[PDB]
Amino acid sequence: SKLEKFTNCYSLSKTLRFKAIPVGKTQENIDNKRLLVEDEKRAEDYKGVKKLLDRYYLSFINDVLHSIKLKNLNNYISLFRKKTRTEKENKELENLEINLRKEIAKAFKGNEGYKSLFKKDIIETILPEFLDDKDEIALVNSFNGFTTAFTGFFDNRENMFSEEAKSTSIAFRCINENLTRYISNMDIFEKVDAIFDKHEVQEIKEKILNSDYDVEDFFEGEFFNFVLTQEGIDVYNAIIGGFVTESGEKIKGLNEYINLYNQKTKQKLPKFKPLYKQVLSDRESLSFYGEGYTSDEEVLEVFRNTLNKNSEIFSSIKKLEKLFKNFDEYSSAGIFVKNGPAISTISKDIFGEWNVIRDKWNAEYDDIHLVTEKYEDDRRKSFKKIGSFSLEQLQEYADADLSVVEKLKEIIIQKVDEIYKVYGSSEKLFDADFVLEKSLKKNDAVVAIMKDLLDSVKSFENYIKAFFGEGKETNRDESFYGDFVLAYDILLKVDHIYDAIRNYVTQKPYSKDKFKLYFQNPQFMGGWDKDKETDYRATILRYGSKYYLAIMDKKYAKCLQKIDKDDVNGNYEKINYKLLPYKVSFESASKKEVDKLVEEGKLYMFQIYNKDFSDKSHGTPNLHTMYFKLLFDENNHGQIRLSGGAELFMRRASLKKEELVVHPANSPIANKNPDNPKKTTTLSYDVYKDKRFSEDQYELHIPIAINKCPKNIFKINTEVRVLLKHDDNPYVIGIDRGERNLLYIVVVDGKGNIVEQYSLNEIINNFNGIRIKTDYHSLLDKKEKERFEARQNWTSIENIKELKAGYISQVVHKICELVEKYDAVIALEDLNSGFKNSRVKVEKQVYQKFEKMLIDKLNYMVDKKSNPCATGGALKGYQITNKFESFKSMSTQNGFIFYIPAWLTSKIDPSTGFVNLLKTKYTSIADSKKFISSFDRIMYVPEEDLFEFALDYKNFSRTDADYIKKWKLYSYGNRIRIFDWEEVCLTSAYKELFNKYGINYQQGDIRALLCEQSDKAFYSSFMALMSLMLQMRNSITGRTDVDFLISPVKNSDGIFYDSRNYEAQENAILPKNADANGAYNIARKVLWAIGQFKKAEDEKLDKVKIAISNKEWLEYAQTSV
RNA sequence: AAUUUCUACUAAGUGUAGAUGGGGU
């Protein structure tokens, strides 16, 4: 078995969360001794103390830099963009810059206690000394011994600034994007001195700190000399950003001065942009990061009401793009446009089709470099190398009088028009006394209003983002860039406010906020060492079927160890974990004495509880529940062991029993699964909505660690390759999405014969023998019908995403069993390549999550029902996958998950192999005549009313991919022309096309007459009917059941493949539908790969490209069948 | 419409079928 090999490979750890319920008098005892209000108090002061800690971190940035500020290595970064050195703009920049990130590191790094500021010591001594306010000092010392709480904050705020740039460091907005706004400062002032006079420059030169007596380092050109990270970033922005004197004197910086020339006398006045500084407080992450949003009226939206910054800059960007026309006179080339995902949309918006830009550039590439297979990839990579497409360069890839610039201007202006349209519909929410009616999460009208405006602005942001380029260019129009970039900086503010309100409304009715329970002990539950039972003061107890958590406290931290054996009692077995957090002994302790302690105030026993610990629990337990019981089982011999550090938190009541939705006792309870025969239930009791969140839970997040001692450690990919070579029959699960099925699975064997083809739209949940199915596809449809109304409210999309994530969890199970029963490599798609968009099913994001959860599941692949110690069982999960690295590491193979490009796997005939490799779109009469002419022989075969189109695929364009190169295209059978559909019979329509135009089809080879036709519209319909002939997947938009494939070519037995012939059959041998074909050939593209492993050498099975190009495909697809 | 938590549920009557690494910014 191929799967069996992969066990005990790596070692992941996990955290089985659970709940604990205060058994005995624990709750009252905790309350008597106020054992948890200090944990609560600290957790309400976390933020407060974080701010104080950050003040010391900001003084570190200040003082250290203030003194050590000479830009060490590169003089004062004088050679920054001076004259090109060895290698133009290559080493010239790169090296100078990287010595730059160390110029800053050295300053900090080894100072007066880097580790005295970034470890426990700060809040204990250094921070109290830094402060002086009694309240603040006491707050900081109340958060002492308790720095194991600020650990994450420490690391974040320390490792973000080192000898690197980018990321979120000082160098970034310290030497990288800081010097872009700097640089023109201490040399050839020149251009910027248009004004800069006695009433201007001299006035401000006396106002600023007289260390910089004159302006010197302020405007000019070439190199710079001041600020760095800290000297007062505001010092540079005193004239560059403007610093109005408190007295009243209007000091207008130095750039805030140009505006008297930059815009008043009109120009671009050499940039001079406001210096960037440390993100948020100290180089954090987002500068707009804020909290709040806890109540329905917590802030009436910072957007025009409580966020006027945003509203201001939509107008600013709008004016800047309305100045695009005079920026043509300035520097149209200077404005760039990032090549990427936006470039296709840009093409459509400006020119008309999504591929104008691409193809125009590809044509120019052909002029200078030449299509074939490898030439496609040459063009591809080189287009990916381009990162900006100047505006005038895009005008060259134009059409006619189409002005790329002006078309962009118009489209992007109408984008803000959309914003303002919804700003007029949100006036109610923006009015001072907004009458809040039914909450906010229940006020779907308000949700919609919010969403609409928030997303209108968000869309403009993403559209105008591109008008940036790659930043690192040359002739950047400085009348555009600079002014535009300032406004855009703010229009990035919306992102946060959108997220805030979205996440408020999409919020659950309850809350899962917890506070770490230290119980007056910073070292609480941090281990399970037998020898140290009084250090962390915690042990897992066991009352036979129940599981507990004993936690002794301060003045009685060793009580249990004295009074153990209760002999003839129930004995809450103390854990005798003699191994390190498998020696899972369980010392039978006390019962009467354990409970005695709980009632007194000594112990604080809690109960570990999952729904599968009830006596009323009827069926299969959860996997985590299983793992938990298995930690303390005899079977676990070192698989799932303890990791140490149970984080007991405390989730309070977010809801109250009285305001929950009840299903009164003895009243028939309607069942909501359409496929439930036993509709209605009538329960003897009541059932409330979310009763666990209406009470107080004590979340015990027990860390556990799977396979910490791996025996069979090997590289997974190479071992998969070896296994997929020595096998006689490599089955491939083959998973494609699809429109009719959500995740159609076509298991295909080692010869390409369909073994199974079932849509996983229905999950047949098997409980007590009875298999009640759930049409997740129909559920999706009903959820999408809810989405249809109220403009896809935020919650409806969340519900779809969550149902799709719960579906994903369900397909993960099914695929796991499919893989297990067939020993089959999945054949998922490399999602970093091309794009399936037709699928009205699992999307890219959800399939990426699917394959992440397949490689997270495939790390410890476990089916619940299987016996724990058998393969596939709880402690023998298959490690057939890798370990999720990134979403871009999902590109080749991650074990039993070959990511194959999904190119032409669905629109290919599964019987012959024919792929339409020919563009059959009527361009001009001549194009189709050459098309018609390149056919070997077009005859009407009246025998079987057909129109044979013998063709040479070696005599065509972009067709090097093919293999047979000689196909006869008989117009036969029925096509569904989706224009919204018509079922056009091919032969009949062609007979009638030829009858109408006078083309006597009854003339043997009539190709000459077809090319003879002088009517333009003849070929139009001719080429469109030819397109239909070649179209294989044919399905009526909507009606599920007409999913058929139809070949224009006959096979070796003369039959034209029909999917509808096979859809009637249960054991079909060829795809029974369109999406089945897809999964069939995705399991066949992986099949080319498997053949490649038996065609490549064993020791060489590692670099065998599994990347199947379309030329080794369309060969095999046209030759094995 | 019950849940360690999530999704679908009622699924044989206080539950069921799957999945579930979480902890700090």
What long-range pairs does A138-147 form, CB within 8 A, spacing at least 24? A139/A45, A139/A48, A139/A49, A139/A52, A140/A49, A140/A52, A142/A41, A142/A42, A142/A45, A143/A42, A143/A45, A143/A46, A143/A49, A145/A522, A146/A42, A146/A518, A146/A522, A147/A119, A147/A120, A147/A122, A147/A123
CA–CA distance from A787 to each of A673, A782, A793, A801 (Å)? Answer: 19, 9, 7, 12
Give A592 CA → B14 C1' in Å.
29
Alpha-carbon dihedral A1077, A748, A884, A1091, rounded to 10 degrees: -110
Contact A17, A701 (CB under 8 A): yes
Secondary structure E strands in A1036-1080: 1044-1045
A1075 is known as an active-site residue: yes
* Pairwise CA distance, residues A442 & A945, whole Å: 64
Q: Which two tokens stand for residue A588?
A: 């039978």
User: Which is it for the CA torsion A889, A891, A895, A896, positive or negative?
Assistant: positive
Q: Which two tokens stand for residue A1036?
A: 């009526």
Q: Is A238 exposed, middle or buried (0-12, 13-18, 19+ CB in 10 A)?
A: buried
The answer to whether A772 CB is within 7 Å of strand B is yes
Collapsing DSSP states into helix, strand and coil, what is residue A865?
A: coil
* Pairwise CA distance, residues A268 & A335, whole Å: 13
Collapsing DSSP states into helix, strand and coil, what is residue A893?
A: strand
* Pairwise CA distance, residues A967 & A1048, whole Å: 9
What's the Rg (C-alpha) of chain A? 35
- How is A707-748 classified by DSSP, letter by letter? -SS-SS---HHHHHHHHHHH-S---B--B---SSSSS-EEEE
Chain B footprint positions (protein CB, under 7 Å): 1-25
Question: Can you name the residues that pair with A949 across neighbouring β-strands?
Answer: A938
The closest nt to A643, taking CA to C1', is: B21
Secondary structure E strands in A520-611: 539-543, 546-550, 576-577, 584-585, 606-609
Q: Which two tokens stand for residue A728?
A: 């006689």
Between residue 695 and residue 714 of chain A, the positions with Cβ below 7 Å from nucleic chain B are 697, 699, 701, 703
Between residue 612 and residue 631 of chain A, the positions with Cβ below 7 Å from nucleic chain B are 612, 614, 616-620, 622-626
Which residue's CA shows the smallest distance to C1' of B25? A153
C-alpha closest to that of A912 among A719, A1053, A753: A1053
* Pairwise CA distance, residues A502 & A495, whole Å: 10
CB atoms within 10 A of CB A80: 22
- The answer on whether A620 is annotated among ligand-binding residues is yes
* Pairwise CA distance, residues A168 & A159, whole Å: 10
Contact A698, A20 (CB under 8 A): yes
C-alpha closest to that of A720 among A711, A708, A732, A709: A732
Three-state secondary structure string covering A912-931: CCCECCCCCCCCCHHHHHHH
* Pairwise CA distance, residues A435 & A430, whole Å: 11
Which is the catalytic residue, given A103, A829, A909, A1112? A829
Question: Can you name the residues that pair with A950 across neighbouring β-strands?
Answer: A937, A968
* Pairwise CA distance, residues A881 & A855, whole Å: 5
- The packing angle between helices A1074-1095 and A716-726, to 10°, is 90
Q: Which two tokens stand for residue A640?
A: 């799932």
A220 is known as an active-site residue: no
Contact A1014, A932 (CB under 8 A): no
Strand order in the sheet with A966-968: A935-941, A946-952, A966-968
Contact A332, A407 (CB under 8 A): no
Q: Which two tokens stand for residue A650?
A: 């405390």
Contact A827, A733 (CB under 8 A): yes
* Pairwise CA distance, residues A551 & A602, whole Å: 9
Which is the catalytic residue, given A83, A618, A672, A678? A672
Q: Which two tokens stand for residue A644?
A: 């140490």
Between residue 661 and residue 700 of chain A, the positions with Cβ below 7 Å from nucleic chain B are 661, 663, 669-673, 676, 678, 681-693, 697, 699
A1030 sits in the region (left: phi over 0; alpha: psi -120 to 50; else beta) called alpha
C-alpha closest to that of A558 among A597, A528, A591: A597
* Pairwise CA distance, residues A874 & A860, whole Å: 9
Q: Is A329 exposed, middle or buried (0-12, 13-18, 19+ CB in 10 A)?
A: exposed
- How is A652-703 classified by DSSP, letter by letter? --SS-GGGS----TTS------TT-SS-----SS---S-STTSS-BEEEEEE
For A580-596, letters b (16+ CB in 10 Å) and e give: ebbebebbbbbbebbbe
* Pairwise CA distance, residues A652 & A971, whole Å: 71
* Pairwise CA distance, residues A631 & A624, whole Å: 10
Pairing of strands A539-543, A641-642: unpaired
A769 sits in the region (left: phi over 0; alpha: psi -120 to 50; else beta) called left
* Pairwise CA distance, residues A154 & A624, whole Å: 32
Backbone angles phi, psi at A275, to 5 degrees: -55, 135
Q: Which amino acid is at A1063?
A: E
Give the position of tokens 């080339």: A333
Collapsing DSSP states into helix, strand and coil, what is residue A845?
A: helix
Q: Which two tokens stand for residue A78?
A: 């004088």
Contact A642, A704 (CB under 8 A): yes
Helical H segments across A118-166, by residue range = 121, 127-130, 134-142, 151-159
Check residue A1100 and report its DSSP letter.
G
Contact A1032, A1047 (CB under 8 A): yes
Which is the catalytic residue, given A349, A1075, A1085, A1112? A1075
A736 is known as an active-site residue: yes
Give the position of tokens 């570190």: A60
* Pairwise CA distance, residues A112 & A127, whole Å: 14
Question: Can you name the residues that pair with A19 across neighbouring β-strands?
Answer: A609, A699
Give the list of residues 6+ apart from residue A934 with CB closer than 8 angstroms, or none: A951, A952, A955, A956
* Pairwise CA distance, residues A106 & A329, whole Å: 47
* Pairwise CA distance, residues A815 & A801, whole Å: 20
Instruction: Report CA A264 to chain centroid distance, whole Å.
Output: 46
* Pairwise CA distance, residues A821 & A819, whole Å: 6
Contact A177, A276 (CB under 8 A): yes
A831 sits in the region (left: phi over 0; alpha: psi -120 to 50; else beta) called alpha
Collapsing DSSP states into helix, strand and coil, what is residue A1094?
A: helix
Residues counted in chain A: 1121
* Pairwise CA distance, residues A1108 & A962, whole Å: 14
CA–CA distance from A570 to each of A588, A628, A937 (Å)? Answer: 9, 21, 92
Q: Which amino acid is at A830?
A: D
Collapsing DSSP states into helix, strand and coil, what is residue A44?
A: helix
For A986-1019, letters b (16+ CB in 10 Å) and e give: bbebbbebbeebebebeeeebbebbbebeeeebb
Contact A713, A7 (CB under 8 A): no
Give the list of residues 6+ apart from residue A125 with CB closer than 8 angstroms, or none: none
Give the position of tokens 């229009």: A491
A261 HSE (CA, 13 A, CB side) = 17
CB atoms within 10 A of CB A259: 16
The closest nt to A680, taking CA to C1', is: B10
Q: Which two tokens stand for residue A843?
A: 């999307």
Contact A498, A454 (CB under 8 A): yes
Contact A1068, A1060 (CB under 8 A): no
CA–CA distance from A1052 to each of A563, A914, A967 (Å)? Answer: 86, 13, 12
Give the position of tokens 């189109």: A949
Q: Which amino acid is at A249?
A: E
CA–CA distance from A138 to each of A37, A50, A119, A538, A635 (Å)? Answer: 17, 14, 19, 30, 51
Contact A403, A395 (CB under 8 A): yes
Contact A453, A423 (CB under 8 A): yes
Pairing of strands A966-968, A974-978: unpaired
Contact A176, A170 (CB under 8 A): no
CA–CA distance from A702 to each of A297, A646, A649 (Å)? Answer: 38, 4, 11
Q: Indicate the domain borders of chain A.
A: 7-19+515-705, 308-338+387-505, 733-893, 925-1091
Give the list of residues 6+ apart from residue A1072 with CB closer than 8 angstroms, or none: A757, A1059, A1062, A1063, A1065
Give A84 CA → B18 C1' in Å.
63
Give A850 CA → B3 C1' in Å.
23
CA–CA distance from A1104 to each of A285, A829, A882, A1091, A1096 (Å)? Answer: 41, 18, 19, 11, 7
3-state DSSP helix/strand/coil % of chain A, to nearest 5: 40, 10, 50
Check residue A533 and report its DSSP letter.
T
CB atoms within 10 A of CB A263: 13
Q: How far apart are the first and last CA of chain A?
A: 28
Q: Is A1054 exposed, middle or buried (0-12, 13-18, 19+ CB in 10 A)?
A: exposed
A663 is known as an active-site residue: yes
